[PDB]
């Protein structure tokens, strides 16, 4: 399976 | 709508797990590589890796 992408930028 | 190309098992509580062939509605796709999706098959909603799904009919 494809590599998972990094998590999204958390919002503040 | 989108369809899953692979299965995906949630890695955090607010992810959405899904199966290959499952139809998903994309509800937010502006926050990064992880999209908020609503499963049309299970009714559940959570984040998914956008590279595991593709546009469907």
From Swiss-Prot, chain B:
Entry comment on modification after translation: The phosphorylated form is termed pp60c-src. S-nitrosylation is important for activation of its kinase activity.
Intracellular or extracellular location(s): Cell membrane; Mitochondrion inner membrane; Endosome membrane; Nucleus
Domain SH3, first and last residues per copy: 1-57
Tissues in which the UniProt entry reports expression: Expressed to high levels, and with a high degree of kinase activity, in certain fully differentiated cells such as neurons, platelets and macrophages. Isoform 1 is widely expressed. Isoform 2 is expressed only in the muscle.
Disulfide bonds: none
Family membership noted in the UniProt record: Belongs to the protein kinase superfamily. Tyr protein kinase family. SRC subfamily.
UniProt subunit comment: Forms a complex with polyoma virus middle T antigen. Interacts with AFAP-110. Interacts with GJA1 and PXN.
Stated role: Non-receptor protein tyrosine kinase which is activated following engagement of many different classes of cellular receptors including immune response receptors, integrins and other adhesion receptors, receptor protein tyrosine kinases, G protein-coupled receptors as well as cytokine receptors. Participates in signaling pathways that control a diverse spectrum of biological activities including gene transcription, immune response, cell adhesion, cell cycle progression, apoptosis, migration, and transformation.
Name of the protein in its database record: Proto-oncogene tyrosine-protein kinase Src
Organism ancestry: Eukaryota, Metazoa, Chordata, Craniata, Vertebrata
Gene name of the encoded protein: SRC
Stretch of the intact protein here: 85 to 141 of 533
